Amino acid sequence: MTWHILGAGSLGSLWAARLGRAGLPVRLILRDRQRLRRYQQAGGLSLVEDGQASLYPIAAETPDGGQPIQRLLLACKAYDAEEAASSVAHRLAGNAELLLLQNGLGSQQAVAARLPRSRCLFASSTEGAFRDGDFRVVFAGRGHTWLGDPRDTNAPAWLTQLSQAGIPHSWSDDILERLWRKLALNCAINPLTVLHDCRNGGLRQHPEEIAALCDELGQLLHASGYDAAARSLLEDVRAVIDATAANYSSMHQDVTRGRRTEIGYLLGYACQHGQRLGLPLPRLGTLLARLQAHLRQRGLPDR
Numbered sequence: 001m002t003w004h005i006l007g008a009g010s011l012g013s014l015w016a017a018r019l020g021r022a023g024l025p026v027r028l029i030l031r032d033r034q035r036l037r038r039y040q041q042a043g044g045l046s047l048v049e050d051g052q053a054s055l056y057p058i059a060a061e062t063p064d065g066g067q068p069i070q071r072l073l074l075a076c077k078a079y080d081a082e083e084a085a086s087s088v089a090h091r092l093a094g095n096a097e098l099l100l101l102q103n104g105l106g107s108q109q110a111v112a113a114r115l116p117r118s119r120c121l122f123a124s125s126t127e128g129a130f131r132d133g134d135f136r137v138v139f140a141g142r143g144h145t146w147l148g149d150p151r152d153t154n155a156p157a158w159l160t161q162l163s164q165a166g167i168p169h170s171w172s173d174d175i176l177e178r179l180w181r182k183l184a185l186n187c188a189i190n191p192l193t194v195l196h197d198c199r200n201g202g203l204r205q206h207p208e209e210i211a212a213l214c215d216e217l218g219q220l221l222h223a224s225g226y227d228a229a230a231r232s233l234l235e236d237v238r239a240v241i242d243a244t245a246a247n248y249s250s251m252h253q254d255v256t257r258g259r260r261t262e263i264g265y266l267l268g269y270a271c272q273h274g275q276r277l278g279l280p281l282p283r284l285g286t287l288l289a290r291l292q293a294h295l296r297q298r299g300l301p302d303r
């Protein structure tokens, strides 16, 4: 019943540390043998909570070696999920279950199609963590993780050992309604924060734009069958603005650091989904066209 962890980043290490320190079998899957040596010279994962650093010596390995994988946590970026899961597709057993921690939509379905003999569970986390070195992660803020599977709504029995490890979670019968809620939340805030180069509190100065975006995002939510999310969206957005008024959004921090943006699974997925239907979403489309041009202007990928 080993917890295999693919993607020893921010969320990946935070999960690996909490699972391993609670006595559960955990195994890190690092990229190559070079990373495995750099991990063994460090001695384990360093977790920083309220300034206090602790060393968790979690066993690690490479994709080629190891035992069969019956439970895998995919904790990489959405644009790397397809390539990550395929690197250990040769070790997946017939009863393997995958926990997909990716943000947005699109990559989860791509992983499910690439691995049809495995069960892919969807997750939506609000926990905060960032890296401060190759094997050092700061537990920046507590949060919650929703779980669920659209095909198989029965909850697995191993949810209890997530509680033992201190990992807050809840099983949702309609997990896609959660992901669409968080996706529409991301589209109304993060693209404008990049184009205007401002904190989330700065969006108060653009109230007409927020209302126009939430309107088109509300139509997209209703056509997707999520009526409750579309009615409360405008007030859900304004609540997040006040709660994170002093913060820079995640997409703003990616562009600032010259990193790739998960746009292809957030605003890009939303504009494509409305096209698959029949909804004209012009303001979301021009917002996407501006954000793509903003990314290309700095040599960053537009997808």
Ligand SMILES: NC(=O)c1ccc[n+]([C@@H]2O[C@H](COP(=O)([O-])OP(=O)(O)OC[C@H]3O[C@@H](n4cnc5c(N)ncnc54)[C@H](OP(=O)(O)O)[C@@H]3O)[C@@H](O)[C@H]2O)c1
Pocket (backbone or CB within 6 Å): 006, 007, 008, 009, 010, 011, 012, 029, 030, 031, 075, 076, 077, 078, 080, 083, 084, 085, 087, 101, 102, 103, 125, 126, 127, 128, 129, 130, 131, 262
């Ligand atoms: N971080 C948060 O607080 C947070 C909160 C909510 C949601 N999320 C979502 O969770 C996901 C992960 O975010 P993160 O901040 O944890 O990212 P991150 O810091 O970039 O960690 C991703 C990790 O995956 C590894 N990886 C990528 N492709 C791989 C491959 N093919 N084989 C092996 N390892 C591979 C990377 O290795 P390298 O070190 O070599 O690059 C990296 O360690 C994202 O979709 C994000 O939107 C994150």
